[PDB]
């Protein structure tokens with residue numbers, strides 16, 4: 547719970563982070579938040595993992611229980627932040643697990659840390675193809691100082707997908723309520739730039755200097771054409787796999803924390819046998 551919350555100076559910035567400080571065999575589980583939310587998204591997943599793993603959740607610049615305005619930064623800076631926390635903490639070997647566009651951090655972290663330190667990754671509910679019209683419009687709305695809130699509302703609609711999902715509604719409407727345009731507009735510029743510059747998550751992962759096992763676990767998009775791009779990518783890359791989780795929303799970490807946990811334990815166990 548909030549018993550594991552700390553704060554430290556990371557270069558210029560005071561960042562909060564979760565660390566259960568569990569004294570156990572590696573690798574540490576590094577749970578990466580997406581944009582404009584914090585460690586609260588992972589409270590149910592931390593419960594699944596707490597007794598068996600050391601679990602660390604960094605919050606990005608301007609993120610946390612008290613969001614704040616900060617200067618412009620991108621996934622590159624998120625990566626330098628994540629590693630500085632891990633260096634301060636004395637963590638060597640880690641398994642990164644990302645929420646959605648936290649994936650840009652995860653894949654760049656894999657490159658930077660290398661396959662000894664970061665031998666595998668798990669990406670959760672991360673749009674594998676380049677932006678379809680509806681999502682591209684969302685990003686344009688987030689970037690708009692007059693329409694960013696409309697932006698979030700449309701994304702909350704897609705994310706909930708017609709479900710009265712109490713815990714996820716709580717996360718979106720309460721736990722993300724204090725994030726403003728400084729975050730949401732940034733999230734729009736960063737994600738748009740990331741696709742523009744890397745093509746896609748699939749292309750970025752394929753382009754790793756050292757490819758290594760990555761699994762995509764997702765609940766949405768729910769249509770067959772999305773499963774198919776995942777299966778086609780998996781057919782093509784030995785190191786890639788996926789699992790459709792069947793959860794109601796964009797936040798499997800919240801709505802199917804037990805399922806997310808068994809995939810993370812599978813990967814952790816594989817690394818230990820290693």
Ligand SMILES: CC(=O)Nc1ccccc1C(=O)O
Pocket residue numbers: 580581582583645646647648701733734737
């Ligand atoms: C927490 C979260 O999902 N954040 C995002 C914020 C803006 C745009 C997209 C996303 C996403 O990660 O899907």
Ligand SMILES: [K+]
Pocket residue numbers: 709710711712
């Ligand atoms: K319900």
Ligand SMILES: [K+]
Pocket residue numbers: 779780781782783784785786787
């Ligand atoms: K495969």
